[PDB]
Short mmCIF file of C-alpha atoms in Angstrom, two decimals:
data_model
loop_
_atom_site.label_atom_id
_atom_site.label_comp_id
_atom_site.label_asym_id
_atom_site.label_seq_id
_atom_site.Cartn_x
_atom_site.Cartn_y
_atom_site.Cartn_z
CA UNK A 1174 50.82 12.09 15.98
CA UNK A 1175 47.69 10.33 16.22
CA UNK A 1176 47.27 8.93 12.38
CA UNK A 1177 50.23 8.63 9.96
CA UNK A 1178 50.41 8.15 6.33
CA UNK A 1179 53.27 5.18 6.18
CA UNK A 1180 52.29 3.43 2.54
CA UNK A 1181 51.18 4.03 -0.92
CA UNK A 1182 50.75 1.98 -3.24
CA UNK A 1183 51.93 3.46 -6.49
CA UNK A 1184 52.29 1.71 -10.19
CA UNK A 1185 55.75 1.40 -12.01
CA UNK A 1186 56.09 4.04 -14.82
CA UNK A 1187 54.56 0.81 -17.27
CA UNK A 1188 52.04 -0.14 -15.25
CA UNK A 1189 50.95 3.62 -14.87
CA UNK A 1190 50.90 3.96 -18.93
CA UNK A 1191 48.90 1.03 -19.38
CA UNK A 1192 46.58 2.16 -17.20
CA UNK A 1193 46.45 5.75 -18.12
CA UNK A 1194 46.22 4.23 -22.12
CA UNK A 1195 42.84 2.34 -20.77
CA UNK A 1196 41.55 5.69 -18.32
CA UNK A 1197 41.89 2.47 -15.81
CA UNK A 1198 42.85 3.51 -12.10
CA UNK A 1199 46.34 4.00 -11.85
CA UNK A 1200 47.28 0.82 -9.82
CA UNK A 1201 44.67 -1.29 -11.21
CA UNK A 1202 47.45 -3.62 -13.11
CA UNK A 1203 49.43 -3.73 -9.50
CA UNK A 1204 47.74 -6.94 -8.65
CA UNK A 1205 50.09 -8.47 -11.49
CA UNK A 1206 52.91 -7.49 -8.53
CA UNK A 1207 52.91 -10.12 -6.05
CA UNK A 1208 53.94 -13.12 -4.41
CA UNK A 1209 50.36 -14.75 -5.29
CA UNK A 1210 50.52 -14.48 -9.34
CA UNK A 1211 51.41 -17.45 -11.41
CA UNK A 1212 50.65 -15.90 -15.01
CA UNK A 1213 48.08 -16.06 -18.29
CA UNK A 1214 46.16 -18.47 -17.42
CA UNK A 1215 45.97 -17.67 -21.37
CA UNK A 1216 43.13 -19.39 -22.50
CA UNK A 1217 39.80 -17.93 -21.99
CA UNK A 1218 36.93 -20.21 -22.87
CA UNK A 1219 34.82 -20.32 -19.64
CA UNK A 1220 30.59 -19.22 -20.00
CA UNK A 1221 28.20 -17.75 -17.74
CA UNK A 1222 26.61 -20.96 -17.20
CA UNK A 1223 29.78 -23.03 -15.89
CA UNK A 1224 31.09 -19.76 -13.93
CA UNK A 1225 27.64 -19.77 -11.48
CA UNK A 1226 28.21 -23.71 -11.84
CA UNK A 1227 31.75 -23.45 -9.80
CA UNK A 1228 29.81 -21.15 -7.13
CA UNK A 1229 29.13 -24.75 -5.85
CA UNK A 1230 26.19 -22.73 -4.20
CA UNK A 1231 28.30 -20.46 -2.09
CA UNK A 1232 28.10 -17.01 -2.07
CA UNK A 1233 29.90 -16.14 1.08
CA UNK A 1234 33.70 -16.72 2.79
CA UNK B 1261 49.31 1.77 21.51
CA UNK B 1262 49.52 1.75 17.82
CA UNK B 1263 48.70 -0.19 14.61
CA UNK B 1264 49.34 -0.63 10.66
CA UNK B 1265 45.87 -0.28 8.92
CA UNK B 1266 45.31 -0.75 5.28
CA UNK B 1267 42.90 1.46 3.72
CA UNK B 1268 41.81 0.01 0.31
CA UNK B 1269 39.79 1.36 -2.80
CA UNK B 1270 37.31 -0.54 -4.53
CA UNK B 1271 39.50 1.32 -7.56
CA UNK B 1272 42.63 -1.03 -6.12
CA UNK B 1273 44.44 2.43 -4.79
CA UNK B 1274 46.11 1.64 -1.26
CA UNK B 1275 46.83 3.49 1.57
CA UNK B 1276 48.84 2.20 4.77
CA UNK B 1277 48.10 3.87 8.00
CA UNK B 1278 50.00 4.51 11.39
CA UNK B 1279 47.36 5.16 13.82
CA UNK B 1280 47.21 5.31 17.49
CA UNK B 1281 44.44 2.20 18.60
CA UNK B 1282 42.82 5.31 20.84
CA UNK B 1283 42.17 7.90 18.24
CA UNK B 1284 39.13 9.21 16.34
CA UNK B 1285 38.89 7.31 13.19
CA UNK B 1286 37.50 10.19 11.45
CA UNK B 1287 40.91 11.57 11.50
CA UNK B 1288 42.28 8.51 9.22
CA UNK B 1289 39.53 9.32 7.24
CA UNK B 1290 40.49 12.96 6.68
CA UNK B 1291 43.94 11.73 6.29
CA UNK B 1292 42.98 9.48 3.51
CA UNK B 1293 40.55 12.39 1.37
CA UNK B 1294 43.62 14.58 1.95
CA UNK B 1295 45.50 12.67 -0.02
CA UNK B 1296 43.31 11.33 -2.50
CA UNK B 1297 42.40 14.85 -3.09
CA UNK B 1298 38.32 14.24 -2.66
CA UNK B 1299 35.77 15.89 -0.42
CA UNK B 1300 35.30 14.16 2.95
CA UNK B 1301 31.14 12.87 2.56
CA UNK B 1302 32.22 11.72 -1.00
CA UNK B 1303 33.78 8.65 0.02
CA UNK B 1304 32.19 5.75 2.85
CA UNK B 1305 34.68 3.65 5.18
CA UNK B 1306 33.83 0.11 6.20
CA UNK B 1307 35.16 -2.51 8.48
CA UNK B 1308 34.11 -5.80 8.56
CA UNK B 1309 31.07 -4.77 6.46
CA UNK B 1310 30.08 -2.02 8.82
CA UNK B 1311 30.18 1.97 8.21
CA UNK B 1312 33.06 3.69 10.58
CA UNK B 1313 32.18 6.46 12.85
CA UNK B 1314 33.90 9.50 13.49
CA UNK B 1315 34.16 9.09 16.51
CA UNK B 1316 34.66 5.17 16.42
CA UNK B 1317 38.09 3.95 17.60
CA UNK B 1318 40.30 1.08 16.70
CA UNK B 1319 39.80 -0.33 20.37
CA UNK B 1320 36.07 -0.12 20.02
CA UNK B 1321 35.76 -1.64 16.89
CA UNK B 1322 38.57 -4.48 17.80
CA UNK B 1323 40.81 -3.56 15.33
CA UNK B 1324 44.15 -5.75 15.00
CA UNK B 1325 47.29 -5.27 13.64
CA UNK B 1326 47.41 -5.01 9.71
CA UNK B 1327 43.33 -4.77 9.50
CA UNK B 1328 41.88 -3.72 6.00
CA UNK B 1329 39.43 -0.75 5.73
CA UNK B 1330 37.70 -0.58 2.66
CA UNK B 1331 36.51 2.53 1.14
CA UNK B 1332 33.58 2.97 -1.40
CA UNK B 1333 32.30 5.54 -3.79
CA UNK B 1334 29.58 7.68 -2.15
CA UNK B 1335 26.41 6.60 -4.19
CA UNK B 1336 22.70 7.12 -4.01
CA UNK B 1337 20.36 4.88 -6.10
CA UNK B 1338 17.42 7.20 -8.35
CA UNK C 1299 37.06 2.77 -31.64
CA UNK C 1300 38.46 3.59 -29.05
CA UNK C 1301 39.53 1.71 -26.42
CA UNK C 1302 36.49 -0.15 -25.65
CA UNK C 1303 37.17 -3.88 -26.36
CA UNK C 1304 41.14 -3.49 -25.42
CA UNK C 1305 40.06 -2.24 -21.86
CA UNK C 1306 37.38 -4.73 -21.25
CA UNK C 1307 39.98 -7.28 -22.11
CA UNK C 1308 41.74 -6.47 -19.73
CA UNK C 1309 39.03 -5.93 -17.17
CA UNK C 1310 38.12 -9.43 -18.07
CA UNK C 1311 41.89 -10.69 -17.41
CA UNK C 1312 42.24 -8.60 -14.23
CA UNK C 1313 38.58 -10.40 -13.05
CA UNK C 1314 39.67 -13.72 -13.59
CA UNK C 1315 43.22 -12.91 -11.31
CA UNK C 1316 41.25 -10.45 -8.45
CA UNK C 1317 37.55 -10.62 -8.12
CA UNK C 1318 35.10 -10.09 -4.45
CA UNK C 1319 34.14 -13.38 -3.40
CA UNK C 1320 30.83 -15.20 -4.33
CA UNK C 1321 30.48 -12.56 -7.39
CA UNK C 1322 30.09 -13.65 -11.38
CA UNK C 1323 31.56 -11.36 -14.35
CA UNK C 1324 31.83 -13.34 -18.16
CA UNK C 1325 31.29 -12.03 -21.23
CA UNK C 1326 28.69 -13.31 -23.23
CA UNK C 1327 28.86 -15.78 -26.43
CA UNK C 1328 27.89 -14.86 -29.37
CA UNK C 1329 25.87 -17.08 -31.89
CA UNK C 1330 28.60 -18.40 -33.32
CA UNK C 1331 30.84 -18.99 -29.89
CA UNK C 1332 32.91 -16.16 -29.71
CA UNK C 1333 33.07 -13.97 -26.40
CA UNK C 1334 31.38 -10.42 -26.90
CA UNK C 1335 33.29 -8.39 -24.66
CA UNK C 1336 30.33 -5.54 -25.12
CA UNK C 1337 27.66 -7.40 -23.15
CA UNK C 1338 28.50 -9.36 -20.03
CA UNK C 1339 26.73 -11.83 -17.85
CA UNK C 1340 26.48 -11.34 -14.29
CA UNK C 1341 25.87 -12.77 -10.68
CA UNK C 1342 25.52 -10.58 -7.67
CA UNK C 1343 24.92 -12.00 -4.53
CA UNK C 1344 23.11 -10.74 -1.63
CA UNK C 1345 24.90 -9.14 1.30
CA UNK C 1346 25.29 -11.94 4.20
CA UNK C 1347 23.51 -10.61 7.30
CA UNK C 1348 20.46 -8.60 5.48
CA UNK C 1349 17.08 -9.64 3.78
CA UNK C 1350 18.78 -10.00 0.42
CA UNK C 1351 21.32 -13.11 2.09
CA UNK C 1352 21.55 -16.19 -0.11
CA UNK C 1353 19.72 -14.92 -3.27
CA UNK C 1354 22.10 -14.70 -6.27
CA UNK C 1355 21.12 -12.25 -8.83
CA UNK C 1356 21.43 -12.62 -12.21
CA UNK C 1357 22.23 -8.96 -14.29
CA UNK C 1358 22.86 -8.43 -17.84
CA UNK C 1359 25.68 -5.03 -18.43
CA UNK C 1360 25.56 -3.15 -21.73
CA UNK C 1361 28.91 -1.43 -22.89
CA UNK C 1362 28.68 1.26 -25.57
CA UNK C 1363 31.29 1.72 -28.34
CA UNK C 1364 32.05 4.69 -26.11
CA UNK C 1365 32.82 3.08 -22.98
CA UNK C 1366 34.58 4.08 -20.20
CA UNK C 1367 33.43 7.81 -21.80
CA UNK C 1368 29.59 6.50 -20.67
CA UNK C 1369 28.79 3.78 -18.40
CA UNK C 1370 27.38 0.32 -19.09
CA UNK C 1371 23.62 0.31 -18.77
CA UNK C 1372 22.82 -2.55 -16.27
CA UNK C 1373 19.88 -4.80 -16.02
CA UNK C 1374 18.34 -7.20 -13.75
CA UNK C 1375 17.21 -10.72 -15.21
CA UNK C 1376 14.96 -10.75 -15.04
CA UNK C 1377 13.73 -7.82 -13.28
CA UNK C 1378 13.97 -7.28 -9.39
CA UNK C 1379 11.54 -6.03 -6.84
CA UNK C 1380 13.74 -3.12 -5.60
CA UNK C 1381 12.56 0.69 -4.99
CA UNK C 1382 15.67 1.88 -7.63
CA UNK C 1383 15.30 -1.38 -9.84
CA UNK C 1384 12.71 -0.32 -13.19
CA UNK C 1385 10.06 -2.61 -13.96
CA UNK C 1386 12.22 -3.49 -17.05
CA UNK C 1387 14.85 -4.36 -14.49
CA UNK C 1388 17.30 -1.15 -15.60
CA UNK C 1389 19.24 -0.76 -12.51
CA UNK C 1390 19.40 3.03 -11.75
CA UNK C 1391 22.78 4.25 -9.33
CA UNK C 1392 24.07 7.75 -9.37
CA UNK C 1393 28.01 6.32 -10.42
CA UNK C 1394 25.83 4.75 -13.56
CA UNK C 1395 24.40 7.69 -14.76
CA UNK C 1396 27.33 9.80 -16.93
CA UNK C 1397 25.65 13.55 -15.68
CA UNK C 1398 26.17 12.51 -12.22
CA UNK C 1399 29.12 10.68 -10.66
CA UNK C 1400 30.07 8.07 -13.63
CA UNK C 1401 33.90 8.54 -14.21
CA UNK C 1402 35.95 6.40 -17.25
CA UNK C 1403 37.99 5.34 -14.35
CA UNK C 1404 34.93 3.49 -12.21
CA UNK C 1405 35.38 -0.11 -13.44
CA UNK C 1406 32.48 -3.40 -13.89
CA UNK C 1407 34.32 -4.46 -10.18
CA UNK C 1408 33.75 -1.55 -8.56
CA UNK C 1409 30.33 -0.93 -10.23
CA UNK C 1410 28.43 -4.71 -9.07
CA UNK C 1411 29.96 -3.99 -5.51
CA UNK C 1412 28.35 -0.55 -5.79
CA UNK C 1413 24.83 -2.57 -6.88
CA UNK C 1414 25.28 -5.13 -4.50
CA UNK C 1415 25.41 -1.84 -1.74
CA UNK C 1416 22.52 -0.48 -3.32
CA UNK C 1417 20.58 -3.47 -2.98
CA UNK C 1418 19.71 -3.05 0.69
CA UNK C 1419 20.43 0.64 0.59
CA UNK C 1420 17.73 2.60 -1.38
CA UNK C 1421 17.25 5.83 -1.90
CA UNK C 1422 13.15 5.96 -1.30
CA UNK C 1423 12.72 9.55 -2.41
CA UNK C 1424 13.71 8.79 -5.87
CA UNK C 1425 11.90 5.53 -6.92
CA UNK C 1426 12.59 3.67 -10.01
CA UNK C 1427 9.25 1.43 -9.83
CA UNK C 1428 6.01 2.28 -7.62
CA UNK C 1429 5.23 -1.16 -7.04
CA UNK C 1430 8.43 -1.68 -4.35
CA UNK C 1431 8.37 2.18 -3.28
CA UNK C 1432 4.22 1.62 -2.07
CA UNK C 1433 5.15 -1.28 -0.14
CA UNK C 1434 8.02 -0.51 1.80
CA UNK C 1435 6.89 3.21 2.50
CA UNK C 1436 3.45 1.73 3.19
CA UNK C 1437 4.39 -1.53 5.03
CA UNK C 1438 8.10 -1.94 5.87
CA UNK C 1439 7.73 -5.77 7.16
CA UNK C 1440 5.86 -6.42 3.95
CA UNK C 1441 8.70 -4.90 2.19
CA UNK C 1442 11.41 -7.29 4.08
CA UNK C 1443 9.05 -10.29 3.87
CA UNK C 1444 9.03 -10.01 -0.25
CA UNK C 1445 12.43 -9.40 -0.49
CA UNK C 1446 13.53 -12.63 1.49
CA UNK C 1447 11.07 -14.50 -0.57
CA UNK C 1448 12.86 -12.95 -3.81
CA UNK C 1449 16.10 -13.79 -2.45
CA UNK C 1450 14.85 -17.47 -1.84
CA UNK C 1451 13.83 -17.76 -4.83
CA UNK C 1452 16.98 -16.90 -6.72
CA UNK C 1453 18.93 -18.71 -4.25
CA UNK C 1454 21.63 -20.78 -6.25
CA UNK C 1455 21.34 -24.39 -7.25
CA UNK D 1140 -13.96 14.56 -37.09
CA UNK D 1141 -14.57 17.18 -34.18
CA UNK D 1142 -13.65 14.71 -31.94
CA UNK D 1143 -10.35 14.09 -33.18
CA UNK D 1144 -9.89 18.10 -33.39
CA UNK D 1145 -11.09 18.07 -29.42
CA UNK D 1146 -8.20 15.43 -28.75
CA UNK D 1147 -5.52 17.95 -30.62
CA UNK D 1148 -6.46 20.78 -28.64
CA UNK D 1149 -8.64 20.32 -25.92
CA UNK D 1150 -10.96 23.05 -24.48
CA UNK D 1151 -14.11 22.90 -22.44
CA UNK D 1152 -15.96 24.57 -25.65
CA UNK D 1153 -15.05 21.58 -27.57
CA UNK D 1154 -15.83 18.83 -25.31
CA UNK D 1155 -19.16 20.21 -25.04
CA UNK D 1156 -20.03 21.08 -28.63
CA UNK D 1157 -19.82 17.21 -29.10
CA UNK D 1158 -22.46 16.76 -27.30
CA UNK D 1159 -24.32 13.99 -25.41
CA UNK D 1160 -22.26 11.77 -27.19
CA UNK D 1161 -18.56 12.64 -26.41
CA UNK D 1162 -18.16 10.58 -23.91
CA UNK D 1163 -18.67 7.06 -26.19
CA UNK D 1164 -16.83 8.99 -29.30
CA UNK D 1165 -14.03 9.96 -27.29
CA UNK D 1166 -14.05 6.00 -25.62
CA UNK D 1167 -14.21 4.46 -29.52
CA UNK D 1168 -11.55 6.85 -30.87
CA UNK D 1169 -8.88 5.69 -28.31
CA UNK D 1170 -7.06 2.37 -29.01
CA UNK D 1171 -7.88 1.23 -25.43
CA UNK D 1172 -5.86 -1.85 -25.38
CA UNK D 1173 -2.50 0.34 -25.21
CA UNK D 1174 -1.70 2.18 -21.66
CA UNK D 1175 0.43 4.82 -22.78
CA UNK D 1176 -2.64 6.02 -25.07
CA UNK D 1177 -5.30 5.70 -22.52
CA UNK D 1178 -2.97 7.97 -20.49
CA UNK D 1179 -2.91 10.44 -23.22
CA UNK D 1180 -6.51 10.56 -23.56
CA UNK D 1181 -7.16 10.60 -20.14
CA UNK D 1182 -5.08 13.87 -20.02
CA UNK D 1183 -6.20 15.13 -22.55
CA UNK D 1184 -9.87 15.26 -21.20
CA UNK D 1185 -8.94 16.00 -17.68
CA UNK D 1186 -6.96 18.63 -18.54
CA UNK D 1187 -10.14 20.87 -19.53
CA UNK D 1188 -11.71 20.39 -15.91
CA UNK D 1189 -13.65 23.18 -14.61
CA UNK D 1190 -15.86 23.12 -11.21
CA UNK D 1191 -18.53 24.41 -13.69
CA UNK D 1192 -21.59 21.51 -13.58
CA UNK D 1193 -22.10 21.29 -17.09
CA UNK D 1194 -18.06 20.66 -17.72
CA UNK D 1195 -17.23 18.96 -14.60
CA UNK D 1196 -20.26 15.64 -15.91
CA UNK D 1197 -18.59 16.30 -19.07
CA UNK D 1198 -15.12 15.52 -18.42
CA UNK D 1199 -16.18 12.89 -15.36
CA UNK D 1200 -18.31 10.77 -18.53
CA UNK D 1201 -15.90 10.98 -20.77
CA UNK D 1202 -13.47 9.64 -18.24
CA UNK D 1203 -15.74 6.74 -17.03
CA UNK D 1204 -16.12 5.76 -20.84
CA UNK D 1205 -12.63 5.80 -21.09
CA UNK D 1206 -11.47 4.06 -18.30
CA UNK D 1207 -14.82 1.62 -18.05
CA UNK D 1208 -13.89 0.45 -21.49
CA UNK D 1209 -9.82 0.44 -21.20
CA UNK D 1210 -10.15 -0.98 -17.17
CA UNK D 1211 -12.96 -3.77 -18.84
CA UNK D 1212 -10.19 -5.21 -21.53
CA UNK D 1213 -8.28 -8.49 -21.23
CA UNK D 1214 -5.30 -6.71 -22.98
CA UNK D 1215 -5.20 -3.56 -20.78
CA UNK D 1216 -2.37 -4.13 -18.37
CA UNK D 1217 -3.53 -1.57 -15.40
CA UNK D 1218 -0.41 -1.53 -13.18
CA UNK D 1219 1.31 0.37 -16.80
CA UNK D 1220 -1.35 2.18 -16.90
CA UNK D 1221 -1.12 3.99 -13.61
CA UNK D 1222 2.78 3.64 -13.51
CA UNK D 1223 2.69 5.39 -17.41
CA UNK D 1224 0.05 8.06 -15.47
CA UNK D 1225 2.49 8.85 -12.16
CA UNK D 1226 5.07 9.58 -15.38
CA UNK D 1227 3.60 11.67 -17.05
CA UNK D 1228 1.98 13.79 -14.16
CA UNK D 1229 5.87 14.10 -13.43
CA UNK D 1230 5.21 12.46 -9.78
CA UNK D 1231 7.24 9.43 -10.68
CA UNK D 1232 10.74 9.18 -12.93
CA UNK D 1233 11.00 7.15 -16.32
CA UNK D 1234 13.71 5.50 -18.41
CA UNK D 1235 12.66 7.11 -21.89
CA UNK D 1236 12.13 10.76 -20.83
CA UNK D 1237 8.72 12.45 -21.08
CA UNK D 1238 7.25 16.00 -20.56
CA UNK D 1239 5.71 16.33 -17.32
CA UNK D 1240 2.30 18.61 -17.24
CA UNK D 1241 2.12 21.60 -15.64
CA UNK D 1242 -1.07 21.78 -14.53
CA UNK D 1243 -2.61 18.14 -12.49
CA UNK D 1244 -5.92 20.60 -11.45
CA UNK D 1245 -7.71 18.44 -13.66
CA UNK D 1246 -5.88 15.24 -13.56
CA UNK D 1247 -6.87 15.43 -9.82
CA UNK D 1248 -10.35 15.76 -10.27
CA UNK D 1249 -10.75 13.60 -12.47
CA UNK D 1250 -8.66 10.76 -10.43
CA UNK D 1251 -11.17 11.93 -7.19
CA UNK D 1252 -14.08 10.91 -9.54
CA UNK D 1253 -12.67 7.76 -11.30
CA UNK D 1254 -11.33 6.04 -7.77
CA UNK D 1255 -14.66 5.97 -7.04
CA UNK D 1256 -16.32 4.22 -10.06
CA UNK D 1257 -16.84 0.31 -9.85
CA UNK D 1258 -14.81 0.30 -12.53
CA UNK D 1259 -11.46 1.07 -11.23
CA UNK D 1260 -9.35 -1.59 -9.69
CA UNK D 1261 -8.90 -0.99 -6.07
CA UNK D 1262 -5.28 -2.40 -6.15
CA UNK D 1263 -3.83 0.60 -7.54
CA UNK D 1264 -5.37 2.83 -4.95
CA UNK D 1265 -2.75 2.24 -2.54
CA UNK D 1266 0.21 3.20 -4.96
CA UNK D 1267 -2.06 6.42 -6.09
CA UNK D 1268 -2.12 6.87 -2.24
CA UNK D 1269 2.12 6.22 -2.20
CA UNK D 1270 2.17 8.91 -4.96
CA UNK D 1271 0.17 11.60 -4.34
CA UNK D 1272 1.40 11.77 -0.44
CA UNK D 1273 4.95 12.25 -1.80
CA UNK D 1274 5.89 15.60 -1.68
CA UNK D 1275 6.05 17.12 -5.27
CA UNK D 1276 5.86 21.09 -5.98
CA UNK D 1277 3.19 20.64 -9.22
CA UNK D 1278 0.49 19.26 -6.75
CA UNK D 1279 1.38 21.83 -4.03
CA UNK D 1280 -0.13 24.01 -6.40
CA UNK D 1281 -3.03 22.13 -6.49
CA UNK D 1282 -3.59 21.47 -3.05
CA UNK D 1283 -6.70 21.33 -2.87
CA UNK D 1284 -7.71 18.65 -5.56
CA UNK D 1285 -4.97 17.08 -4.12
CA UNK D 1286 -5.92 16.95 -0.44
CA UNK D 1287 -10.01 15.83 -1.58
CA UNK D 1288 -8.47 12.90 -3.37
CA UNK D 1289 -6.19 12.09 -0.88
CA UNK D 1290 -9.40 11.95 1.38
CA UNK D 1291 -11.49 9.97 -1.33
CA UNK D 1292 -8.28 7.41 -1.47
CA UNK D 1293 -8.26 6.61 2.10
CA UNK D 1294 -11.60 5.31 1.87
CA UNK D 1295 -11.15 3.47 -1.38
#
């Protein structure tokens, strides 16, 4: 076989619902499910202004 | 002879591929609308920025073990 | 009402988390301070490697009580030279338009990276604005030459 | 009075039957500081074109009023104006959705004689050029109109 299907990546029944709820994409919450995530990161205060400020002028990796 | 890709939505969906570094990447591509269930020219597949030929292969494009393809929405601005 | 605000919540919470690199999404403040979650602020930049490189432009995105039913409407600020860009900056994209391919389940990430595409891919036989369709159908090099002087000059501070 | 009953429902009779003086009544009747309504008026006029002599000066005065006097203001944006025209001869697309004319016989004619006035400002020509090249079905049906003021353009 030259190309095999080996992974999906497919939400938990919650994850699925709260997406569904939303008419999000199905595995859009999966990033929550990870070794990276620390958590809420509650507090949401940041503006436009000081968001383009932390660019620090660059736009590229 | 053969690699792990990652195909991956701009929608977050994620599809892991098994595919032999001499094949037709059009193929991968037909796996992947297969699955999702959409026509073939509806969806565009890009590596390292770049559009993927059928008839590109891993080898020629330098693909390496657990390399990401991302896939977009077909889209035409009016 | 709906599930507008609820889902941009959470596209908001999800953006903060897992967002493309060198890319802005925030909701704007209202008079008084609070967030409006119906009209965001954002920052797309240029794709490195074409004309557009280093410019980093600015777009207002209007959500309906309706939304994800109908798209956002999107707008340059201010307005960009661009064959698909309106002189009142309305961006215009096939996945933005809800009798064409807008589904609830496109999202504000996947719509600026669909933008950002768009910026150096037009589609010339369906002009927005005849100002940028003249030039680059007329002189391509005088296209490229105003668009890296546009990109220049919303190059970030 | 008559004039304003030309405007609602133009005809070559009516134009005429106003005499001499249609083409500074039609001119003074239209708010010429406002694009959108010199486009209307424009239309309006061209759209009762005829090769015929006496209606052909007729509708080319009343255009060079027009235009002389909207072209001549400090208010008159001109890119609108021709971006507002391209809209609503259905060769270019608009946000806020119009009714493209069927019939640009006129509208061409009339554009072949007002590209030439010292009037009009020779910037625009090359998007009129742009838009008139670009293959639409309405001017295929006026091809020839179209093809003399793609001629007259290219030496604008």
């Amino acid at each position: 076989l030259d190309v095999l299907i080996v992974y999906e990546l497919t939400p938990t029944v919650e994850e699925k619902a709260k997406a569904d709820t939303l008419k999000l994409p199905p595995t859009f919450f999966c990033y929550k499910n990870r070794p990276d995530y620390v958590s809420e990161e509650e507090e949401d205060d940041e503006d436009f202004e000081t968001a383009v400020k932390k660019l620090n002028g660059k736009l590229y990796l | 002879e053969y690699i792990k890709l990652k195909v991956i939505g701009q929608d977050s969906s994620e599809i892991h591929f098994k595919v032999k570094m001499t094949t037709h990447l059009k193929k991968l591509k037909e796996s992947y609308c297969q699955r999702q269930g959409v026509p073939m020219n509806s969806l565009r597949f890009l590596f390292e920025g770049q559009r993927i030929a059928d008839n590109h292969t891993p080898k020629e494009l330098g693909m390496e073990e657990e390399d990401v393809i991302e896939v977009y929405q077909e889209q035409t601005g009016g | 009402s709906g599930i507008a605000l609820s889902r941009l919540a959470q596209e908001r919470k999800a953006w903060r988390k897992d967002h493309p690199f060198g890319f802005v999404a925030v909701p704007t403040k209202n008079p008084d301070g609070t967030m409006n979650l119906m009209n965001w602020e954002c920052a797309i930049p240029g794709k490195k490697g074409t004309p557009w490189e280093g410019g980093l432009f600015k777009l207002r995105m209007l959500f309906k009580d309706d939304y994800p039913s109908s798209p956002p409407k999107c707008k340059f600020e201010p307005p960009l030279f661009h064959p698909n860009v309106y002189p009142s900056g309305t961006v215009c994209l096939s996945i933005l338009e809800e009798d064409k391919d807008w589904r609830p389940a496109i999202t504000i990430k996947q719509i600026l990276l669909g933008i950002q595409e768009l910026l150096n891919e037009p589609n010339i036989q369906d002009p927005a604005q005849a100002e940028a369709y003249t030039i680059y159908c007329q002189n391509r090099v005088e296209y490229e030459k105003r668009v890296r002087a546009q990109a220049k000059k919303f190059a970030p501070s | 009075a008559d004039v304003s009953t030309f405007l609602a429902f133009p005809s070559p009779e009516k134009l005429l039957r106003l005499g001499p003086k249609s083409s500074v009544l039609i001119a003074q009747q239209t708010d010429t500081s406002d694009p959108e309504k010199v486009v209307s008026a424009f239309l309006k006029v061209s759209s009762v074109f005829k090769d015929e002599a006496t209606v052909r000066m007729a509708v080319q005065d009343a255009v060079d009023a027009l235009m002389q006097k909207a072209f001549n203001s400090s208010s008159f944006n001109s890119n609108t104006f021709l971006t507002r025209l391209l809209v609503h001869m259905g060769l270019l697309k608009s946000e806020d959705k119009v009714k493209a004319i069927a019939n640009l016989y006129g509208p061409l004619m009339a554009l072949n004689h007002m590209v030439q006035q010292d009037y009009f400002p020779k910037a625009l020509a090359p998007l009129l050029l742009a838009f008139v090249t670009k293959p639409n079905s309405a001017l295929e049906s006026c091809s020839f109109a179209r093809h003399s003021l793609l001629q007259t353009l290219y030496k604008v």
